[PDB]
Amino acid sequence: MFMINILMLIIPILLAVAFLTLVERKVLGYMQLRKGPNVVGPYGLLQPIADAIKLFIKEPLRPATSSASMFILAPIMALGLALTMWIPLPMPYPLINMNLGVLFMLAMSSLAVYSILWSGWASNSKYALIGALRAVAQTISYEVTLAIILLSVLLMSGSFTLSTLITTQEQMWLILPAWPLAMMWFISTLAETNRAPFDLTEGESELYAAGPFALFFMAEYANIIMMNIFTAILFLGTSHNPHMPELYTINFTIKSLLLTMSFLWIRASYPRFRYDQLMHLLWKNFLPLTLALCMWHVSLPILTSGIPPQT
Amino acid sequence: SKVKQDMPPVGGYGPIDYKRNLPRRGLSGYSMFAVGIGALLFGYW
Amino acid sequence: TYKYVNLREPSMDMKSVTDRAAQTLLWTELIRGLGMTLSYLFREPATINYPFEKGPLSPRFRGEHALRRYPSGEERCIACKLCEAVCPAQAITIEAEPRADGSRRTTRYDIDMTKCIYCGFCQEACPVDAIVEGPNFEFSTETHEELLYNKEKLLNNGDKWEAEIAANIQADYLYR
Amino acid sequence: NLTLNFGPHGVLRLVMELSGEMVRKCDPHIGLLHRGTEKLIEYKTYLQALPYFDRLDYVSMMCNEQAYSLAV
Amino acid sequence: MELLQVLKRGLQQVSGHGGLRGYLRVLFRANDVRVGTLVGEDKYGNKYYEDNKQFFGRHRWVIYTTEMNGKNTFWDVDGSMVPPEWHRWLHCMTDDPPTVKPPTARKFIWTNHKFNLSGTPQQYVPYSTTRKKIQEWVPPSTPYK
Amino acid sequence: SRGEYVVAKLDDLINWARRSSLWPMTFGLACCAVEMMHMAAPRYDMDRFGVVFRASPRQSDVMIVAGTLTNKMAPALRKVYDQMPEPRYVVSMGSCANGGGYYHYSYSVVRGCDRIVPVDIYVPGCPPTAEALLYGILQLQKKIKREKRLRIWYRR
Amino acid sequence: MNLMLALLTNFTLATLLVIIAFWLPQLNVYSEKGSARLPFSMKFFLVAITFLLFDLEIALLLPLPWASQTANLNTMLTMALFLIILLAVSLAYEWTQKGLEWTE
Numbered sequence A: 001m002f003m004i005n006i007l008m009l010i011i012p013i014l015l016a017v018a019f020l021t022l023v024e025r026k027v028l029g030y031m032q033l034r035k036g037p038n039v040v041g042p043y044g045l046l047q048p049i050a051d052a053i054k055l056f057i058k059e060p061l062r063p064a065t066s067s068a069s070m071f072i073l074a075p076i077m078a079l080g081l082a083l084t085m086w087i088p089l090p091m092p093y094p095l096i097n098m099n100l101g102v103l104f105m106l107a108m109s110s111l112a113v114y115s116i117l118w119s120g121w122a123s124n125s126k127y128a129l130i131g132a133l134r135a136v137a138q139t140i141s142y143e144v145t146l147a148i149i150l151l152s153v154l155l156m157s158g159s160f161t162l163s164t165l166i167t168t169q170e171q172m173w174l175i176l177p178a179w180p181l182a183m184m185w186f187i188s189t190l191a192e193t194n195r196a197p198f199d200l201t202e203g204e205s206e207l208y209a210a211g212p213f214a215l216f217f218m219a220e221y222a223n224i225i226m227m228n229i230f231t232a233i234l235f236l237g238t239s240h241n242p243h244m245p246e247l248y249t250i251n252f253t254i255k256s257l258l259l260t261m262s263f264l265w266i267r268a269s270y271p272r273f274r275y276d277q278l279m280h281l282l283w284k285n286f287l288p289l290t291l292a293l294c295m296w297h298v299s300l301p302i303l304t305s306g307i308p309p310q311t
Numbered sequence B: 001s002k003v004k005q006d007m008p009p010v011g012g013y014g015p016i017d018y019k020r021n022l023p024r025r026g027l028s029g030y031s032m033f034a035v036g037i038g039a040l041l042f043g044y045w
Numbered sequence C: 001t002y003k004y005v006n007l008r009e010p011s012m013d014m015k016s017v018t019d020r021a022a023q024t025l026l027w028t029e030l031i032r033g034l035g036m037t038l039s040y041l042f043r044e045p046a047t048i049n050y051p052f053e054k055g056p057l058s059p060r061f062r063g064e065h066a067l068r069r070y071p072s073g074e075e076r077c078i079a080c081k082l083c084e085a086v087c088p089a090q091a092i093t094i095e096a097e098p099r100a101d102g103s104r105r106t107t108r109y110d111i112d113m114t115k116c117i118y119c120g121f122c123q124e125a126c127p128v129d130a131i132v133e134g135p136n137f138e139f140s141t142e143t144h145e146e147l148l149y150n151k152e153k154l155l156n157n158g159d160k161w162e163a164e165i166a167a168n169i170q171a172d173y174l175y176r
Numbered sequence D: 001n002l003t004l005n006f007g008p009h010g011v012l013r014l015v016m017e018l019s020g021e022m023v024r025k026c027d028p029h030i031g032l033l034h035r036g037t038e039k040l041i042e043y044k045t046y047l048q049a050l051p052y053f054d055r056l057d058y059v060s061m062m063c064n065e066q067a068y069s070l071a072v
Numbered sequence E: 001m002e003l004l005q006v007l008k009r010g011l012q013q014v015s016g017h018g019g020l021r022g023y024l025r026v027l028f029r030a031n032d033v034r035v036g037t038l039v040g041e042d043k044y045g046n047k048y049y050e051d052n053k054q055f056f057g058r059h060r061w062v063i064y065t066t067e068m069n070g071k072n073t074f075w076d077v078d079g080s081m082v083p084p085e086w087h088r089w090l091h092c093m094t095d096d097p098p099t100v101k102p103p104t105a106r107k108f109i110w111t112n113h114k115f116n117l118s119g120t121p122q123q124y125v126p127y128s129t130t131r132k133k134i135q136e137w138v139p140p141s142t143p144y145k
Numbered sequence F: 001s002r003g004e005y006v007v008a009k010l011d012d013l014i015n016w017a018r019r020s021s022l023w024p025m026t027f028g029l030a031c032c033a034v035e036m037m038h039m040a041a042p043r044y045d046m047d048r049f050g051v052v053f054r055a056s057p058r059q060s061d062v063m064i065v066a067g068t069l070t071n072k073m074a075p076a077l078r079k080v081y082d083q084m085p086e087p088r089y090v091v092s093m094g095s096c097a098n099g100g101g102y103y104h105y106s107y108s109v110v111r112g113c114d115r116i117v118p119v120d121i122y123v124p125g126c127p128p129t130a131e132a133l134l135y136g137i138l139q140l141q142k143k144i145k146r147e148k149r150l151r152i153w154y155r156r
Numbered sequence G: 001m002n003l004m005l006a007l008l009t010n011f012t013l014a015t016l017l018v019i020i021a022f023w024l025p026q027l028n029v030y031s032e033k034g035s036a037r038l039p040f041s042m043k044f045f046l047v048a049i050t051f052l053l054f055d056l057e058i059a060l061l062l063p064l065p066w067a068s069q070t071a072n073l074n075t076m077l078t079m080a081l082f083l084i085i086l087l088a089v090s091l092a093y094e095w096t097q098k099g100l101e102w103t104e
């Protein structure tokens, strides 16, 4: 009965990723005064299926890699970890109810950088290795603010349990007391997921194929959705009625959908940061503010007498 | 008969805009900061 | 007369400085940029439903070549070679001889459609409206050889498209 | 000083010498669209050469035609 | 609310295409369920529609025939299937369709339009249209050396 | 038999997927690239057909040669063709790419890109209109629809 | 046991998708068609090392939600601010010493 539950998480995640490719293309299209996919199936509803099949029956052109084991390892790590990020998410009930669920997500997400590094080693080309190292530097840099911002929020929640964020926001969304952190959290997830205006892996190589390309893409888009589900829980907490858990699931899904659409909205609206500039956005802007807001959020519950319970 | 070639209408065409038109919007810095701090205080309370 | 595009002093009073700080910290100009892309999402797109709908063209449009006839069915071309002479790309090749009835007619009339620049100079040069660029633009092929037109192909194009070619000529010939 | 045989209208080959992030040398290698227009024009009449000017700055076709027409 | 007036217009497209089957047929053949006025039909089965309230470019369209010159065109439609008389109207080279302004009849004009024949046995194959230029001497058929 | 029938349906499925998801690598060599841009532009929106605006050469299924191929450029174009994973198709667009066009008699111009790579579709014009190019892409789709890779495989 | 099963399922499925993505029918019958200093800036080393040191500081701040439940709040608040201030002093030192610059 538990294996059924695992599959009923994995399969919808992969299907939602597939159709996010359609939604991204159509939302971007209409913001560009065009339509996007509307021929392959009604309203392009078969476009993700055609793309998936095409990619997998495509010739898997892998150049003689400097490491066969690390060539295979990188996509397995990327996709395996991406799905793991979903198992503690309360929707409203998590598949795995972890006491330290928030900490588990932070620890697993910090491992996702190995897929970038290993794929750089396996490419057998110093140019791609240098591109990998630049991406790793961007990713770890923005891990600093995500962790500190998350810690600041939990000082109002009282624990590392993800479902306790639901209780904390019973009366009010945490975005109201913590909109400054929500702002930097949101931008940090964009940079974390290498999304525009932080899509410098794509831009710099401009200035993988077939199934293995498809797998890295699936892991990326699974992470994008999961990040926005996390943001909704962290800052836009949905109320949970224990006798009607599906009302929570409907409302919480809408918020996550909208947050994910805002990722596409932002991609349509701005030019790209230079690499040194997104490094300065972190080290010289976000980090000073995050540190100061971290000091403030340690003091605030103590000085207001608003320390949350441990349990 | 008469010469008929593409010509402007008698009296010319109507005026055509070309100058930049980026209208002013929103509140001042003071008001925006006030609303933001007001939200924080209500949130903290 | 000239104007300056970027020569202005920001106001350094407290109200103005606080306006720019709020813009820096609250991302107001970026939010205003989000507003414009949002309004486009809700505009009707400009896409047309090709091939069921087509982009608009005019009678002057320069497309696929064709050789025309008189109403009697006689060929208009009398092998004067003015088109061959003017062709900027040397895309036209012509041979001629007296026809069995003594008429001055071509035995070869070729257009290399992969040399042609679709400039229309041939149809300007022709004294008898024999060679025209027709309205057809949907004639891509699977092989290079299919685009090397001989006289039979060009005469077939004329008989195929004459209905539309004549009407287009009827609409533009007073501008020529 | 690292060297890149190509970095970033047509097609350009840019040979660049880098030092970290900074560009030290930028050596454009053009001619990837050299089609001997100026030589071909010598074999054309003045009218026949006019269409070659549409295909120079092929974003500004009629301005290119104007320059040639004024010269003639 | 206008939302209701929009939904009603959506439902009238279903009846305007002759029920659900006809509405679905045009949805999958042409990816468009708009309803327009029938301007006319050509001898091959293509139907031509107009709606002058649409923006220029979308105000004229053709629903291609399902069979032309012995080819199944239910799914495989082509822009070259439009015959010349309607080609002028469909591309807005003129305002008046061939049903109001018929083309001039000629003995030599193709009575049967052909679409793009590339890739098929009917494709054009180029060749030289001139006869041999030099005649070779043919030696005598009898012996005499 | 069913075995032939299963092959016929599988060929339809793979053909449908491949022609429904044509990702082009556009070699924007000269003016023909501008009309290629107008095909991606809102009026024609090639993306609506499943033809993404700009794919990377390693994720590409079709190369569009859009402009004059000079001698200096010919080696680079062939290198990109050889790096494309299969199945791969080439669309030659415009007179220059088709057979040299206006510059056919130049000392520095390859007289047709089909001297360097195999070509599936030739789009005539100087330049072909955006609509003419779209007609050519749709013609390539119909060519892929006619492929019978699996039918020929099982008669081997 | 559940967490182990979830992890085993996630990476087993990831493995299956990867291998099948590599080995699919191809329908062809013909032959198919080192440890040095990478030229990479010392600046990128300093980013990674700077991330590590900040990450170690973050490890020490993580217990803060639990520490706020202590009756020794005076000590706890003083030490939390001390640690974060020292983290800020670290950033100020790198910043004023041009450790965050990307030129040169």
Ligand SMILES: CCCCCCCCCCCCCCCCCC(=O)OC[C@H](COP(=O)(O)OCCN)OC(=O)CCCCCCCCCCCCCCCCC
Pocket (backbone or CB within 6 Å): A180, A181, A182, A183, A184, A186, A187, A197, A231, A235, A266, A270, A281, A285, A286, A289, A296, B036, B037, B040, C024, C025, C026, C027, C030, C031
């Ligand atoms: C009473 C006691 C209370 C004490 C606490 C009071 C605190 C409130 C007052 C402080 C407000 C803090 C604001 C926090 C947001 C971060 C601010 C910030 O970092 O902005 C500056 C940053 C860089 O600014 P720049 O123009 O480059 O110049 C600075 C360098 N010289 O500029 C940027 O970061 C620009 C962002 C680039 C990314 C653009 C793409 C995102 C745009 C759409 C975002 C939509 C809004 C996000 C909402 C998310 C909701 C979940």
Ligand SMILES: CCCCCCCCCCCCO[C@@H]1O[C@H](CO)[C@@H](O[C@H]2O[C@H](CO)[C@@H](O)[C@H](O)[C@H]2O)[C@H](O)[C@H]1O
Pocket (backbone or CB within 6 Å): A052, A053, A056, A057, A058, A059, A060, F010, F014, F086, F087, F149, G025, G026, G027, G028, G032, G033
């Ligand atoms: C997601 C599930 C989808 C299930 C669909 C199952 C269909 C199984 C049939 C697969 C058909 C693949 O079709 C085949 O794919 C390979 C991709 O490498 C292509 O490429 C292959 O053949 C060419 C020559 O033809 C070789 O040069 C190339 O190295 C080789 O990889 C073939 O040109 C194509 O004919």
Ligand SMILES: N=C(N)NC(=N)NCCc1ccc(I)c(Cl)c1
Pocket (backbone or CB within 6 Å): A017, A018, A019, A020, A021, A022, A024, A025, A048, A049, A051, A052, A055, A214, A217, A218, F052
């Ligand atoms: N960025 C976009 N949204 N478009 C785009 N290039 N999508 C990639 C297409 C894709 C990749 C993997 C899978 I699995 C599927 Cl189904 C589809």
Ligand code: SF4
Pocket (backbone or CB within 6 Å): C083, C086, C087, C088, C089, C090, C091, C092, C111, C115, C116, C117, C118, C119, C120, C121, C122, C123, C133
């Ligand atoms: S259109 Fe121009 S290039 Fe083509 S045949 Fe006529 S004159 Fe020659």
Ligand code: SF4
Pocket (backbone or CB within 6 Å): C076, C077, C078, C079, C080, C081, C082, C083, C084, C094, C122, C125, C126, C127, C128, C129, C130, C131
């Ligand atoms: S087509 Fe016209 S210009 Fe050319 S040879 Fe014939 S009559 Fe002369």
Ligand code: SF4
Pocket (backbone or CB within 6 Å): D055, D058, F030, F031, F032, F033, F066, F067, F068, F093, F094, F095, F096, F097, F101, F102, F125, F126, F127, F128
């Ligand atoms: S075929 Fe014509 S439009 Fe295309 S690149 Fe050559 S000259 Fe330019």
